[PDB]
């Protein structure tokens, strides 16, 4: 269940979406991402129902897909293991307070550890359908 180059199915889906958004830019993607990390971090006990957690998680993922995409991650192709919730805090905090790659690495490595990873994807593909529809 744990992923193997579904990067061409997500980087595109989101590429797909963001092209329907005229005013799109990088400073805002960055903010929405940060807001979703805390929004997700909130959905835990430091708790809330399972269903409701990977929704925020999926929401963070879409923004990480945008960053690298707006960065033009030139064909870059890391799976990390996390022992505690606080070990995810630390990570985000230096990629943030002291600084693209890690920004997209992060929602996924959570999936590996916090959840299944082929179980996050089903939330993302579902919403972006409802989203591409809305726009």
């Amino acid at each position: 269940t744990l992923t193997i180059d579904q990067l061409q199915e997500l980087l595109q889906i989101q590429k797909e979406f963001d092209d329907r958004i005229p005013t799109l830019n990088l400073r805002d993607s960055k903010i929405a991402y940060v807001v979703e990390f805390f929004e997700w971090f909130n959905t835990l006990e430091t708790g809330k129902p399972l269903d409701v957690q990977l929704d925020e998680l999926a929401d963070m993922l879409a923004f990480g897909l945008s960053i690298a995409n707006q960065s033009g991650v030139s064909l870059k192709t890391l799976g990390k293991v996390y022992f505690n919730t606080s070990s995810i805090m630390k990570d985000f905090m230096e990629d943030f307070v002291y600084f693209e790659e890690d920004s997209l690495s992060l929602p996924l490595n959570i999936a590996y550890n916090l959840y299944s990873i082929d179980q996050l994807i089903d939330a993302y593909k579902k919403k972006m359908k409802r989203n591409h529809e809305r726009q």
Binding site: L24, D28, A32, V34, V35, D59, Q135
Partner: protein
């Protein structure tokens, strides 16, 4: 008065929200901070209302300002009540 919300203040706010939920028995200084945190919540809501994060509304289906104008203040209210 620079209109557009900066990445760093947005970051500062959520951080303070988390320190708040970790204060832990006569510490009544936490309640002050909730009062502070409600007000800058409104501050941020109004700014984002006037000048919105666009990508956020498109991916979320809801205006980002509402999260600061209404949901966090709701939450900080919930913590206020939990008290005795």
């Amino acid at each position: 008065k620079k209109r557009e919300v900066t990445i760093e203040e947005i970051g500062e706010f959520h951080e303070k929200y988390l320190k708040l939920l970790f204060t832990n028995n006569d510490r009544k200084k936490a309640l002050a901070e909730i009062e502070k945190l409600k007000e800058e919540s409104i501050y941020l809501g109004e700014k984002l209302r006037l000048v919105p994060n666009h990508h956020y509304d498109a991916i979320k289906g809801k205006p980002m300002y509402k999260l600061y104008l209404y949901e966090y203040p709701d939450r900080l209210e919930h913590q206020k009540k939990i008290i005795l």
